[PDB]
Write a protein that binds this ligand. Structure first.
Ligand SMILES: *[C@@H]1O[C@H](CO)[C@@H](O[C@@H]2O[C@H](CO)[C@@H](O)[C@H](O)[C@H]2NC(C)=O)[C@H](O)[C@H]1NC(C)=O
Lengths: 171, 55
């Protein structure tokens, strides 16, 4: 949408990915596997909860309108009261709604940025041992085990291990 | 004639302060009080206008 991962180059979602918000799908020999990233999904949960807690913590003052009654001889006073209550009312409506609209945008953009950033973490980690297809998947120039895979998803990838091997299979 | 009466009774009030004396004196027409209302529990309350009843 703004970072173009969600509903972008990664065209659609993974109805089988249900252990988190974002993550991986490795398809080697040993098996397949929808498997959620930990770090990014957690950080995204911590951010959002922190956000809505920061929204319910911002509109919590008091107390009453104290509710007043006026004569048929103080109708300017009565209206002044009315004008000031409706007045504040409108302000707190606008404020609540605009906040809602804005933090909604920024929320969706946050997920988008989150996903992209992840794909950028994996891409810049792998480097040229792969084919950046651009459906959001990578095609390996070597054999990657349920062991080489599950080494990428926790940030550790010996590039110069598979360097020469993949250079060969590439050409 | 409201309520079958052409006469009126006009009431006024006050908050009598602690240790202060109120003084009534009249040569007529005084509807005096027999009671006073002490304030037993101050607190942020309210008056709600409803036709309904408490459940
Ligand atoms: C009305 O009643 C009150 C209570 O008895 C009086 O207040 C006391 O006044 C005496 C003498 O003036 C003082 O010794 C006390 O200290 C007061 N009481 C307290 C606890 O403050 C008041 O003076 C009386 N006033 C009248 C009109 O007689």
């Amino acid at each position: 949408g703004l970072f173009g991962a969600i509903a972008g180059f990664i065209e659609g979602g993974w109805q089988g990915m249900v252990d988190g918000w974002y993550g991986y799908h490795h398809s080697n020999d040993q098996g397949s596997g929808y498997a959620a990233d930990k770090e990014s999904t957690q950080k995204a949960f911590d951010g959002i909860t922190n956000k809505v807690n920061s929204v319910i913590e911002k509109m919590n003052t008091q107390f009453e309108a104290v509710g007043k009654e006026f004569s048929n001889l103080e109708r300017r006073l009565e209206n002044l009261n009315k004008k000031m209550e409706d007045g504040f009312l409108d302000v707190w409506t606008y404020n609540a709604e605009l906040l809602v609209l804005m933090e909604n945008e920024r929320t969706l953009d946050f997920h988008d940025s989150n996903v992209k950033n992840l794909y950028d973490k994996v891409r810049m980690q792998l480097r040229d041992n792969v084919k950046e297809l651009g459906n959001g998947c990578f095609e390996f120039y070597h054999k990657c085990d349920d062991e080489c895979m599950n080494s990428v998803k926790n940030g550790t990838y010996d590039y110069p291990k598979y360097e020469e091997e993949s250079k060969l299979n590439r050409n | 004639k409201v309520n079958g009466l052409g006469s009126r009774m006009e009431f006024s009030w006050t908050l009598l302060d602690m240790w202060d004396t109120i003084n009534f004196e009249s040569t007529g027409n005084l509807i005096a009080p027999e009671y006073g209302f002490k304030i037993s529990k101050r607190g942020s309350s309210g008056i709600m206008k409803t036709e309904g009843t408490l459940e």
